[PDB]
Every structure is written in C-alpha cells, then in structure tokens.
Amino acid sequence: MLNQELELSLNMAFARAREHRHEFMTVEHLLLALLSNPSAREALEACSVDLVALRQELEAFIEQTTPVLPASRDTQPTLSFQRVLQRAVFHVQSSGRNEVTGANVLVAIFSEQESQAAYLLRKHEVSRLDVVNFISHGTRKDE
Amino acid sequence: KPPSMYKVILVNDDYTPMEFVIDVLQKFFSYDVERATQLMLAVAYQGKAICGVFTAEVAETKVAMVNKYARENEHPLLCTLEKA
Numbered sequence: 001m002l003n004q005e006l007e008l009s010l011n012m013a014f015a016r017a018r019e020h021r022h023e024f025m026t027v028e029h030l031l032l033a034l035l036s037n038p039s040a041r042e043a044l045e046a047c048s049v050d051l052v053a054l055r056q057e058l059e060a061f062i063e064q065t066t067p068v069l070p071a072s073r074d075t076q077p078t079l080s081f082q083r084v085l086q087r088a089v090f091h092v093q094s095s096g097r098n099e100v101t102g103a104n105v106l107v108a109i110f111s112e113q114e115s116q117a118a119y120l121l122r123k124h125e126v127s128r129l130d131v132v133n134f135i136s137h138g139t140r141k142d143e
Numbered sequence: 144k145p146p147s148m149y150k151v152i153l154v155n156d157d158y159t160p161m162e163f164v165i166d167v168l169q170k171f172f173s174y175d176v177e178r179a180t181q182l183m184l185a186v187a188y189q190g191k192a193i194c195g196v197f198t199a200e201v202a203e204t205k206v207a208m209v210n211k212y213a214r215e216n217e218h219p220l221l222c223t224l225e226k227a
C-alpha cells in the first residue's frame with residue numbers, strides 16, 4: 001500500500017518532472033527520487049554505490065533525453081514507469097506483505113531491461129540479487 | 144551495454160488527412176508548422192519518415208500515445224519505432 005515514505009518519493013519525482021515541464025516522468029526520475037528514499041538509499045549504500053556520481057548521471061540523462069512540453073496536456077508516466085510500480089505492488093501482495101517500500105520499487109527497476117536506470121545500476125556493479133539479499137537477509141553488505 | 148536509441152516513424156496510408164498528420168507532428172513532436180509540413184510531405188512522398196530519435200523508454204510511450212490519438216480520431220495513421 002506504499003508506505004508514507006514511498007509516497008513522498010513518488011510525489012517528489014512527479015514534481016521534479018512537472019517543474020521542468022517534462023513530457024514524461026520516467027524510470028530515471030523515479031530512481032533519482034529514490035536516492036533520497038531511506039529504504040532505497042540504505043540498500044544502495046549497503047551495496048557500496050557512489051551516490052554522488054549516480055545522481056549526477058541520472059540528472060544529466062534526464063535533462064538531455066526527456067522531451068519538454070511546448071508552451072502551447074500534463075506530465076505523463078512512461079509505460080516503463082507504470083510497469084515498475086505495478087511490479088512492486090504485485091510482488092508485495094503476492095509475497096504476503098502489507099506495505100510497498102522504496103527498496104521494493106528499487107528491486108522492480110531491474111526488470112526494465114532497456115531503461116537507462118537499470119543500465120546505470122549495473123554500471124555501478126549492483127545486481128538485483130545484491131539488493132534482494134540485503135533486504136531479505138542480514139545487512140548482507142556487498143563487502 | 145547502454146540502452147539503444149530508437150527512431151519514431153510515421154507510415155503513409157491513403158485515408159488519413161494531411162491535416163491530421165500535421166496535427167500529430169505538432170502535438171506530439173513539438174514541430175512548428177513549416178517543419179511539420181515538410182515531414183508530412185516526406186511521409187507521403189517516400190512512404191514513411193523518421194519523425195524523431197528518443198530513448199527506448201520515451202519512444203515506446205510516444206508510439207503508444209500517437210497511435211491512440213489516431214485511433215480516437217478514427218484515422219489509421221500508423222506510428223512505429225525502429226532501433227539504432
């Protein structure tokens with residue numbers, strides 16, 4: 001049911017997009033907003049990822065690839081974005097849990113193969129398993 | 144292995160009005176009248192034309208939106224996407 005922390009993040013990404021009159025709120029918008037999500041930040045820190053760089057990369061990517069709306073139709077979620085969020089909701093429900101966290105959403109991002117977000121995560125050597133191990137079992141740090 | 148970029152393309156058909164194609168280029172591709180007109184012409188002349196290059200993610204959504212608009216306005220305007 002999306003814990004309150006996630007809602008904030010989802011709202012944050014959405015505002016980020018509208019604020020720049022972006023035609024689309026993308027998966028990359030989602031990830032950047034997740035960097036400030038405790039549940040999501042913790043998993044990434046546990047995976048030893050340079051959050052300074054990642055933020056730079058995502059922000060640079062969003063600016064250069066996201067179409068802007070003409071001064072002359074509001075911001076819209078990409079189909080990729082919708083799948084990620086729906087994937088997280090489903091898995092939480094199907095695994096018998098009450099709330100969806102940022103970490104669960106983060107996990108679901110790895111399923112969007114052609115997303116820049118999945119690519120950037122792999123570039124920082126973070127796989128889906130690494131995040132899953134940290135969430136379920138001990139603070140299983142990458143090392 | 145960065146995600147690949149995609150060409151968003153409009154295909155020519157005999158039932159869609161040129162006026163509608165121009166509408167599409169303006170509403171979804173942010174083209175002005177002049178640039179939109181020559182792109183619709185290229186579509187009619189060459190059979191199809193590349194209307195833009197976007198990231199896979201954006202391209203996928205853009206194609207679905209354009210086709211949805213065409214269908215809602217009862218036109219067969221077919222929009223597709225190609226890699227590279």
Ligand SMILES: [NH3+]CCC[NH2+]CCCC[NH2+]CCC[NH3+]
Pocket residue numbers: 094095
């Ligand atoms: N596609 C069907 C989804 C099935 N989900 C099963 C989740 C079960 C989680 N607990 C597994 C038990 C671990 N020993």
